Structure formats: C-alpha cells, structure tokens
Amino acid sequence: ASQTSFSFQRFNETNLILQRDATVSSKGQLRLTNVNDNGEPTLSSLGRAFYSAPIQIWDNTTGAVASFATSFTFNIDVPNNSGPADGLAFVLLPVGSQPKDKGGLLGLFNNYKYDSNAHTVAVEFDTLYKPRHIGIDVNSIKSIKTTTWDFVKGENAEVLITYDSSTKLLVASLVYPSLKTSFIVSDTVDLKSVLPEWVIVGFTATTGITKGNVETNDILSWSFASKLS
Amino acid sequence: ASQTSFSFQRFNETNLILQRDATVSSKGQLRLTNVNDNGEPTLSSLGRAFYSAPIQIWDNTTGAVASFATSFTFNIDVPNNSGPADGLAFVLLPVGSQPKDKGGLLGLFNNYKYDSNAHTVAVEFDTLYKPRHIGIDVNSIKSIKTTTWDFVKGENAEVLITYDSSTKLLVASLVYPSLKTSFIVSDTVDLKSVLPEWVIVGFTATTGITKGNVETNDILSWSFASKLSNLANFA
Amino acid sequence: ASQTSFSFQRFNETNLILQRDATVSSKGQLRLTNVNDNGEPTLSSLGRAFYSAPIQIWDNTTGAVASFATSFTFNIDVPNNSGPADGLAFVLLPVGSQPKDKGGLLGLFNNYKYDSNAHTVAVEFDTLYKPRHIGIDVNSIKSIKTTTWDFVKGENAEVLITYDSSTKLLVASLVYPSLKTSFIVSDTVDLKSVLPEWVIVGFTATTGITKGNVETNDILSWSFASKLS
Amino acid sequence: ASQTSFSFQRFNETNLILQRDATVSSKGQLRLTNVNDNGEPTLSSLGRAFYSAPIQIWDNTTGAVASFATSFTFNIDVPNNSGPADGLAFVLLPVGSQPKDKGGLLGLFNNYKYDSNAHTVAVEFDTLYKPRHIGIDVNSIKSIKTTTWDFVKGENAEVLITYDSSTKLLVASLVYPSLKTSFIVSDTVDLKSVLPEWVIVGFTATTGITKGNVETNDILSWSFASKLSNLANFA
C-alpha cells in the first residue's frame, strides 16, 4: 500500500537533505565528512545526508511494519601517518531528525547506553580500534551485535543493509571489491517498538577527534527501497 | 544514473507537499479542492499536491533527459443541480513552484497566452464547458493538443501519464473503471527546452467560480517513477 | 506473493518462445510476421512470441487475481500499392498455448463468436478496414470494446496494456511518437472466469490473406510485469 | 537493454525447471533433496531447481556483462542421531545444464579438480565436516574462497547472492533469522570468461552418502533479478 525507491550513482543537493559537513562534490560524490582544498580529511567532522522524502516505516491502525533495503558505496580513506576514525552509518531516523554527537557517537546518539526515545536504527562501520567492526545499533551506539571488520583505507566499500519486517531481522554486510573481503552482521530489531511510523533514511559519518585518527567518509552511490503493507 | 519511484494507495501529509486547498482526509484521500463538512465541493477552490522529493529530469553536462510516468485515481463529483468546473491536472513544475490562477487557469498559469518562462508541462482534465477535454499543457493553458473527455461526476478516474525522453512524447490517458470509458492525448514536448533540470511532480485542481459550476477533485492513489541516464513494471 | 518482470530493447531467441514466423532479426527486432530477403512483408504470415517463463494470473485457493502490464514498440509497415492487414495483438494465453487462425483471427481464435474455453485475453491492433481499431478481446475476436485507430504505415507504435485485478479493467493504448497520435480502449474483464491460473504472455500478428493487404509486424522492444497477491 | 526479475514466496512446478529429487510440496516449498513420507530426509539425494526463463548475463558484441542478485530462504534439517551433509548451492549454469555428481560434489562438478569447461559459478552451503562453510565455486568444487558457516539444523536460512559486473565481485551471505547468525564470502569472478552469454539460475543440493549424514534442503522462497546494459529495490 506504500512503496518508495530511489537510486543515485551521482549525488545532487536537490533531492538530498544535507546536514552538517555533508556535501556533494563537483564529481557528485556525497562527502559525508569534510575534506579541505589540500585534499585532506579533517578531524571532528560530522555529516549526515538524507533523502528529501520521508518513508513510512509502519502503520499503527493496521500494525503493519515496513521492510526496507539500502545499498551504497563508500570510500573511507586515511592519510599516511594517520589511523582511521570513526566511521559512518546508514540510519533510519524520525522525520526532522537532527544530528547528534561527533566522534564515536556518529551523529546518532548522545550516549553509550540504551535510549528508547532515540527511535534510531543504524548500521555503523566503526573504523575505531574491540576490533574494527560493523555494528547493528538499536537505540544505542553499543551495538546489540557486531562483527569484526578488516578495514582497509582508500578502498571502496559496498554495503547492503536489509530489514525484513516479518522476521524482524536486520542484516548489514560490507564488501571491498578490490580486496575481495567481506563482513556481515545480523540481529532482530522490533522497528514498531523502536521507530516512529515515518522516518528519513540516509547516512551519518564522523572523523576522529584526535590527530592521526581521521578518514574521508564518501558515499559514491546510494539506493534505497521500502515497502509498507 | 538516477531513479526515483513512489506509490501510495493511501495518502499522508508526511511525504507530500500540499498546496492551497489540497488536503488528505482521515480516509487518506488527497482532496485537491475544498469539500465542506456537509460533503459539498465549494466554488473558487484550488489545490495542489506534490511528492516531496524533487525529480531530476535532465542534466546539461551529458544532455540526458529523464523519462517518467505517473498514475493516479481521481474522483470528480458534482452536487445535484450543478455542472462541473474546472478540472484537475498532473504537473511537472520547477522545484518550489507554487499555485497559479484559479478557475480555467487550473493553478498552472496566469493568463491564456503562451509563456516560455512557465517551465510547465501539465496534463489537464478540463471539466469546463468547446467540449470537456484532456489537454497537454506546455507553457500555456491553451493546450498544444486536446482530446474530448466525457466527464462523469462521482466516478473514480484512473489516469496514466508517461513521457519518453528519446521521442519527447508525452501521453496522458484517463479511464473510468466503473463506466469503462477511456480517453487519451499525446504530443511531443521538449522537456529540456521547457522544464528545468529538476522538477517536482504532483497535481493541481480548481473548481468553478460561478454558482452551479463546482466539483470535488479527489486523488485516491498515486504512483510516480522517473529515470535519468519501463512503464510495464510501473503500473 | 508472486511477481514477474522482464524488459528487452533487443530480442533474443534464448528467453523467448517463438511460434511460427516470429523471428528475432540480426538487429534483434522481434519480427512477428515474415519478411523476405527482398525486404518485403509476405501474405498469410502468423507469428507469436512469448516469454519463456509462465506467469501466474490467479490462485484458486486464495481467489487472488493478478494485475499485469505490458508495453512494447511495434512497427507495422506497408509497401506502396498495398493496404495493411491484419494487425497484431498482445495476448495472455494458457501455458503451452499454440497458435490459432491466421488473417483476421490473429493466431488467437478459431471463430468470430464467444468461446469460454479460449481462455484468451487479447488487445489487438486491427489494421483491417468498421474502421481500423484497437480492440479488447475476451474469449472472442469480436472485441467486447473497440476504438478507432488511425493507422499509419512505417511509424513505430508504442503500446501499453494494463490490467487491474481489483476493478477488473483492461486498458490498451497506442501512440505514434513521430505523428503524435494516440488511441485508447478500456473494458472490464473477469480474468478469474476467463483465464487459467497460469498463462504465457506475448504477441501474435498476422498479415493479410489477399494481395495488397500486407504489413510487417515487428516488435522493437517489450516489457512485461505481473503481480499476484 | 535487458532486465529480468521474479519473486516467489510459494513455489510452483509451473515456472520452475526441477531437476532430480527437487520437488514442490503441497505447501509450496521447494524441497531440493528427498524427504520421505515419514518426514525424514534420505541419503544420496540430489536435486536442482531453476527459473524457467534463461538470463542473459553478457553479450560479446558490446562487451557488456550482466549484474545480478538472488535471495532465497532455505531450511536444512537433520534427523536426531544424524549429522548434516552435504549442502545446497545457488548456481548460474549454462542454459540446459543438468545435475552433476552427488555428495560433496553438490550436483555441480564431476571431480575435485579445476575444470574450465564447467562454465559454473556457484555459491555453496557445505554442511559436510575443514569446518562447514559457504564457498564460491568457479569451475571447481574446491571453492576459490570459503567462509566458515555455523550450520544449525532445522532453522530457516535467508541467503543473498549478488554479482556486480563492473567490479566482477560475487558476494554470498546467509542469515539464520531465528538464531540471528550470519555469514558472508566474496571473490571476483570473471563471468564473461567463465559463464556463457546466457545462463539459467537456480539451486542444487545433496544429502550425505553414509548413514548419519543427511539433511533436508528446502527452499521456502526465492527472488532473482538481472540487468544487462539495484540490489536495494531487489530485497
């Protein structure tokens, strides 16, 4: 009864809600976090980017809950002498949601505990070394579930995140095409009890806070779909 | 390079840009023009509604022009002892476009003259009686092409509008599922020379201005898809 | 619970069920009816072409009925001195369905009456002059509903046919891009009472039987989709 | 230029090519290997099932290579006092491909050696214990790459396999929705140099050959899409 779908290989401001350092470069890359004119990634960067149309995630009258999927290509690069930090995340957030905290909290949470009012589901790619990991975030930066991630700088990473409303299972996977490595994490998420009926979808990324802990957080392409019975 | 598509059988304020008298009823109907609590449509009404995400329909860098398609179900009803006016339209408009003049101008134009700066492509369902018609509007309310439309009050109408950027052909069709009647009109439109690179997509409708010329202009469901470098998949 | 979808801008034998004169040319056009080496369309030609996978149209256990849509581009050309005949049709037919009669019966019917066992729904583009028309065919070549069609030779025609299982309305439209003319016809069809649960979809075309009544019947591209709850 | 996609939550003989022990139960489950009427899976079973329409995955004229994606839910169950064997696989095979050897060879190969003429790309779920694994097979049962798979009997498994022809990267993943466990493996495959222009897509599965190594190999639902010149839309 409701469907939404979009796909961009080249980003443009016009149908995005850009928050903070998120820009679309002249080459149409969604640079979530800031890169200076020298071409260097800057510390303490936070960017979020959302599709301009909200998505219905469930309907209280029917009790129906949406399924959804998103894929994107990201490039996280780290200059020599630096380590990576902090990562990026794909997020579903309430309509009108504004960025939260930088660094390890990814513009998503304001603390390291459970927060039922966060109404946040996220899959984060945590470049901060608990080893580097992909985490499923349900109302918490403390992933209810993680998997080790062998992060490699400068290599495009392709992500797929799916949520099945019937099983309630959220699945996130990352692949490095050029390195042919891959990582996956899955856990159940009751969206109905976590998210509002309508959400915005997109990204959030942060760079490290301390020198030598920095990265680019570029989304090179993005696709999203959701279906609500 | 770019794809957008959405589909709603029940509307909601949340992902729409509603303009003027356009409302979403508690039944989830998109009522483009005003209906009073006594259930009657009111005169001098205009409403518009758009999907909230802008659609890219071309880029000058590559010279690619988008193809697109939309379908919707509408209900135009007329109170007893009234005639219908004025119609509704599906439109592609510059991002940020706002309602224009009432009545015969359909919220799309300010005059009856050709206007190159309108950057307007619209498919109009004209209920004002030149017989009642569906018209393709390019930068004018004087449709560049029309077909007769045997309008019938209170009957759900299913519309499909498609544009193929290769042929520059715009096609609009209306069917009354319960009367089994159908109408179609087509003409080339050079979107690239008419519309800006990005557009909003949605509807506009007006009621008549003099007593006994009025109608509901309800949209019951809506789908849209566009691709910038497949209608079957779409309907 | 069931979906099927395909789209080809260039045909290939490999995923088609070609019946009779239907060929795929070296340029990947689906030539439903025969064209000789001289480049002339031949009389008494019949071709049908179907997608190789059957499509479920309804389910007797649920009583659910599929919606479906198809679009295609066709080019019907007529040599000088000839008139056009007979047309082509998009069809839904029982799985394993074999061509019926040539000429005015379009490879679809064996008579000009109602036949409940035909289990055939068709939209025909009748080039035979009742003026030339698009017709909706439900178990009969005698369209339950027609609309005048100003046929023009050599001009690509773009067709869309949709069936909505909720209203039961079948709609067929034709447009000539280069001429910007268009035609449409709609009527209700109870598929459940007409078609088997599974069907094959595709085309049928015929050329005239008598000299000076001939045409090419080329499908240049084709898309189909169907959904069954 | 070409797109194909289908999706079934309930299977039916009608649009499938079923091979060997593969059946569709009255509940509409795709049972790739044999289950007796006492409900128990039997030894030395092999079954395959394919979508009936061939898929174009490249053309040499233009040098375009298809991208594709498939998802499916499977259930591998083991009787008490048995271990599992041998697994199931999703496969792309030449049009007309037929089942190969049983057991560890999964109906995909005849030997344990590399075979360039196999024109086989497969993602295998190996239940035979080298720990139980998911493996990418290119012209060999000796997976060019594997990952450990913590197989659990009787639990529905959701698989997703994708191929991107730009990167030549094949990715396969399995999740157990009720155990919340998940596994993934990826490697480049040059489809163009491995597979023919057209392929059939579907599944293969085998049970063990010695007593106490057996399993069900049920597919409960399946989706496939391919494009020859969008995973999100697909799942």
Ligand SMILES: *[C@@H]1O[C@H](CO)[C@@H](O)[C@H](O)[C@H]1NC(C)=O
């Ligand atoms: C985005 O679209 C606008 C047209 O509205 C264009 O001028 C601009 O170049 C585009 N940006 C990118 C990064 O392509």
Ligand SMILES: *[C@@H]1O[C@H](CO)[C@@H](O)[C@H](O)[C@H]1NC(C)=O
């Ligand atoms: C629209 O969604 C909101 C939740 O944001 C809900 O409260 C409201 O009932 C919906 N409107 C309709 C007409 O269903």
Ligand SMILES: *[C@@H]1O[C@H](CO)[C@@H](O)[C@H](O)[C@H]1NC(C)=O
């Ligand atoms: C169809 O596909 C085959 C490859 O199996 C190819 O050899 C042939 O040229 C193709 N036909 C057309 C008309 O493109």
Ligand SMILES: *[C@@H]1O[C@H](CO)[C@@H](O)[C@H](O)[C@H]1NC(C)=O
């Ligand atoms: C498959 O479809 C046929 C109709 O062709 C039907 O009789 C049968 O019940 C279906 N099979 C299943 C398992 O639902």
Ligand SMILES: [Br-]
């Ligand atoms: Br931009």
Ligand SMILES: [Br-]
């Ligand atoms: Br929505």
Ligand SMILES: [Br-]
């Ligand atoms: Br860098």
Ligand SMILES: [Br-]
């Ligand atoms: Br590093």
Ligand SMILES: [Br-]
């Ligand atoms: Br921090």
Ligand SMILES: [Br-]
């Ligand atoms: Br971990």
Ligand SMILES: [Br-]
């Ligand atoms: Br809400």
Ligand SMILES: [Br-]
């Ligand atoms: Br840090």
Ligand SMILES: [Br-]
């Ligand atoms: Br993407």
Ligand SMILES: [Br-]
């Ligand atoms: Br609302």
Ligand SMILES: [Br-]
């Ligand atoms: Br406004």
Ligand SMILES: [Br-]
């Ligand atoms: Br207003």
